[PDB]
C-alpha cells in the first residue's frame, strides 16, 4: 500500500506454500484518486 500525490496505489500477489526464503514480484492492481491525509490503519 502506497499513497503519494493524492493517489492511493495497491499492489498484490498470491502464492501457495516464519516467511519463506524465495523471490517473487508484485503486479499493480488498484489506483484511486482519494486525496486525503492518512496516518494510522487497522
Partner 1 sequence: CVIAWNSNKLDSKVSGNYNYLYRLFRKSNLKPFERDISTEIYQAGNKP
Partner 2 sequence: IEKSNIIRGWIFGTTLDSKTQSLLIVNNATNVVIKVCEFQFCNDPFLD
Task: Provide the binding-site residues for partner 1, judged by CB under 8 A.
Answer: 5-6, 35-37
Grid cell for residue 27: 503486479
The option from partner 2, partner 1, none interacting with 4 (CB < 5 to 8 A, set by class) reads: none
| Binding positions for partner 2, 20-39, rule CB under 8 A | 30, 32, 34, 36-39
Cα gap 23→25, rounded to integer Å: 7
Tell me which residues touch partner 2 (CB under 8 A): 1, 8, 17, 30, 32, 34, 36-42
Amino acid at each position: 500500500f502506497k499513497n503519494i500525490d493524492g493517489y492511493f496505489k495497491i499492489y498484490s500477489k498470491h502464492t501457495p506454500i516464519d516467511l519463506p526464503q524465495g523471490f517473487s514480484a508484485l503486479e499493480p492492481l488498484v489506483d484511486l484518486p482519494i486525496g486525503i491525509n492518512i496516518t494510522r490503519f487497522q
